[PDB]
Write a protein that binds this ligand. Structure first.
Ligand SMILES: *C(=O)([O-])[C][C@]([C])([O])[C]C(=O)S[C][C][N]C(=O)[C][C][N]C(=O)[C]([O])C([C])([C])[C]OP(=O)([O-])OP(=O)([O-])O[C][C]1O[C](N2[C]=NC3=C2N=[C]N=C3[N])[C]([O])[C]1OP(=O)([O-])[O-]
Ligand SMILES: *C(=O)([O-])[C][C@]([C])([O])[C]C(=O)S[C][C][N]C(=O)[C][C][N]C(=O)[C]([O])C([C])([C])[C]OP(=O)([O-])OP(=O)([O-])O[C][C]1O[C](N2[C]=NC3=C2N=[C]N=C3[N])[C]([O])[C]1OP(=O)([O-])[O-]
Lengths: 450, 450
């Protein structure tokens, strides 16, 4: 099975959102804090009609239709998420609804979890399945779905919500460079959900950044070690056209690439010139526990990194910045907007992907995109995904009406025996969206279309 | 990568248990109900010192040691479970504790969930990984871990609890027959956990059996279809030496094999002789919704099946029957006791495995066991696992002291900021068991050894 990777792709996010500027005011934050501080524009959220299942039906239904895939042609379907509706019954069984008709029940895969990382877990699982002795010739399908949703304090501005669907197969326009990757996994308490009854994480936002970069440095090192063996050269930031990142908010996207850049210094690689070596040089004598904790250094990193970041990272940022944290689908929404923006420069280019999940589980990995044939083309994908279309059909909510909706979702999380209030909302959704109709007294869930 | 499957194996279950006969009395059930009705002998349970993490450290630690595996040699580690302690932070990160020292952080995999099925999900994931272009030459390690635990009514007698660890690699004494398998997945509400705050499932025990067999008939059909292509013959119960099953209680183990037998009739295969065709014959005119719902038919099925079941299924039953439902580790505990019992007849034999998970996700799949070389031998495995040893070092609890412990675990499930009460318990565990020391106010968990 040759050149396996992603053949086709679709996305779905709720059209309902709150402008970040409008919110800053609501919260009594300052002029800059969300639009400059977090570097976010607009935050999308599930109201009472939407959840990780419905978002899922949306992105799956939309992919099969638009790339014209026969649902008989699917032989593995996995889901990555961290939003839990049931502790035992996976989202992947809910989705089996759509194959209940095509008569196609012989489909491997369940859900993969660990925090922003499950989607990646699944992706790899599907690639590996296509490449294995048990591959039956049919497609893989991976769904990354999540609703990111936080309690009052300073983490609420970073929610977001979306599903992504990826079809996996041989002869892909987006080809995995199988051996060029680095993971880092560890036992760690930076962000987690111990509180079974609430949607809300316990987040230690200091640790939450120090561990993200701890993991990014180790992934990058492990990827560099592989690259030496493969290609005979030391890896620099110069060796990839684009870096794509898990994007919980744009600020941290910028510090991440700028950290790659700093890693290059430490290794004294190709992309570090003489002027940089001096700028960086005062910081040589710091411990790592110092390199992570140190603001002067972030400051200096970003400045050297500025112009490269504009070349290599900037075009991955459209969707995250206009939607918010999409947890497992974040990376792949960043990758999507990259395809939206530079689908024409892309043939022959190398995309480096960094997946992070708190707790922690992480993997950087590499893709070679290429000249391929529709339906499964860089152009057809960008076209099919209609990211400009979708951004255009959004519906704003005054911060108020959003705070309200938040309090409502909090009452619905975990609960039973409520029909959902339709009016003012149903007609905000595109004809053919799936939506929650009710939850019976046995917590069973019912969806309608349209 | 040749002949990939399971190279080595270990198990762990809590030594603490309640005799099923002793319990029947407690509950005011009748003479037969648990020992004959469910066909269970003895039920193992986690007390306050044990959980799915500690059980996990136990089976992992024990495997690495006893098969003498260097923890640097592990390159993928996945966990299958359905017991949730944290909604986002996977058990697989807790286990990363043990590689925090060997310095080995570059390990793929997270948790797979769907009900009794996650372990199988993981197993396949690891096989597929060894077989993929991204395989780095190191071992797979799969952990199946669960604590099965039910509220008062007639499902409490069917709890159980255990971890299993399986090392995955080429040149295995237990070889996957890659193409000989059948899955069945569906959206269904037979058993699930909607109640985020309780350990207890919502179970619809009628549906729970009708769906199990619905899935078993479809898996078996899909496996038969494959076998025709492969070997040129129609599959009968005669075509495998042993059938191994998810074993939530032995009764349903017997109806499962006997159903395979009935499936053979329907297909009119090799293993159905003339006398059987008549016995079966009144039931020809039933709908499936009749074949599932019909007691006369179970009755007739088991009777034909009796002697074969004693040959092909009976020796897989030791551990399940003396431990109880082990959820994702159940199948593999049944497989383990099969290796314990018939490790000498096993070279050259075919084992057929049926994995089920409610909600529902299911897969039958096949193994060819073989003549191999220690450490990774059928004899060394049976030896290492010491199933007779372990059954001997169990500690009984009067039904009382068990009901008490249950009420205690209910208070601890989901909670924070309690040190665990040691005395009367610590000394019941084998020197070197991991155990919960405390849970702080930030729900973080602390384990000691021994
Ligand atoms: C996964 O596996 O599923 C889990 C995750 C969540 O997916 C894993 C991740 O991706 S981790 C990414 C990091 N964490 C999160 O996304 C967690 C959720 N969010 C938060 O905890 C908060 O939003 C954090 C802590 C990240 C930020 O909020 P604050 O507490 O407000 O931040 P603070 O530390 O005070 O600094 C904020 C930032 O903004 C700047 N700033 C403040 N005021 C400003 C301003 N900029 C411009 N104008 C104004 N008025 C401040 O200087 C700082 O930014 P810098 O860029 O460092 O200068
Ligand atoms: C996974 O994905 O993680 C989820 C699972 C749980 O792993 C998926 C499964 O493996 S499903 C397997 C089936 N379900 C379960 O394990 C769920 C938990 N248990 C239960 O729901 C109950 O224990 C059930 C319903 C299975 C049985 O309990 P009862 O309600 O007591 O059963 P009932 O329907 O009344 O019939 C019981 C059985 O026992 C016989 N019997 C009754 N009294 C007897 C007696 N036999 C002998 N002596 C006495 N006194 C009765 O006739 C029947 O047995 P038969 O063999 O049919 O005759």
């Amino acid at each position: 099975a040759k050149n396996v990777g992603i053949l086709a792709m679709d996305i779905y996010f709720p059209p309902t959102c709150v402008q970040q500027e409008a919110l800053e005011a609501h919260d009594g934050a300052s002029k800059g804090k969300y639009t400059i501080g977090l570097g976010q524009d607009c935050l999308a959220f599930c109201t009472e009609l939407e959840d990780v299942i419905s978002m899922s039906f949306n992105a799956v239904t939309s992919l099969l239709e638009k790339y014209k895939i026969d649902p008989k042609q699917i032989g593995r379907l996995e889901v990555g998420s961290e939003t839990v509706i049931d502790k035992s019954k996976s989202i992947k069984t809910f989705l089996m609804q759509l194959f209940e008709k095509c008569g196609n029940t012989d489909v491997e895969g369940v859900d993969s979890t660990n925090a922003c990382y499950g989607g990646t877990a699944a992706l790899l699982n599907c690639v590996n399945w296509v490449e294995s002795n048990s591959w039956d010739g049919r497609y893989g399908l991976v769904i990354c779905t999540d609703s990111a949703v936080y309690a009052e304090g300073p983490a609420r501005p970073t929610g977001g919500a979306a599903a992504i669907a990826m079809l996996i197969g041989p002869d892909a326009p987006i080809v995995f460079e199988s051996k060029l990757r680095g993971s880092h996994m560890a036992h760690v308490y930076d962000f987690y959900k111990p509180n079974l009854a609430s949607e809300y994480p316990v987040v230690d936002g200091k640790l939450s950044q120090t561990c993200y970069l701890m993991a990014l440095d180790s992934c990058y090192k492990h990827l560099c070690n592989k690259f030496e063996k493969l290609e005979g050269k030391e890896f620099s930031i110069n060796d990839a056209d684009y870096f794509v990142f898990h994007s919980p908010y744009n600020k941290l996207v910028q510090k991440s690439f700028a950290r790659l850049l700093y890693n290059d210094f430490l290794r004294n690689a190709s992309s570090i010139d003489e002027a940089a070596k001096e700028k960086f040089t005062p910081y040589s004598s710091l411990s790592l526990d110092e390199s992570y904790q140190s603001r002067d250094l972030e400051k200096v990193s970003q400045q050297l990194a500025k112009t490269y970041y504009d070349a290599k990272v900037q075009p991955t940022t459209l969707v995250p910045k206009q939607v918010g944290n999409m947890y497992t689908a974040s990376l792949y929404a960043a990758f999507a907007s990259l395809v939206h923006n530079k689908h024409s420069d892309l043939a022959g280019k190398r995309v480096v992907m960094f997946s992070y999940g708190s707790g922690s589980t992480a993997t950087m990995f590499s893709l070679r995109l290429c000249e391929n044939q529709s339906p499964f083309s860089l152009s057809n994908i960008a076209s099919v995904m209609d990211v400009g279309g979708k951004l255009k059909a959004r519906h704003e909510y005054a911060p108020e009406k959003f705070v309200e909706t938040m309090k409502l979702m909090e009452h619905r999380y975990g609960a039973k025996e409520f029909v959902t209030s339709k009016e003012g909302i149903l007609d905000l959704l595109a004809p053919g969206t799936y939506y929650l109709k009710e939850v019976d007294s046995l917590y069973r869930r019912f969806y309608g279309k349209k």
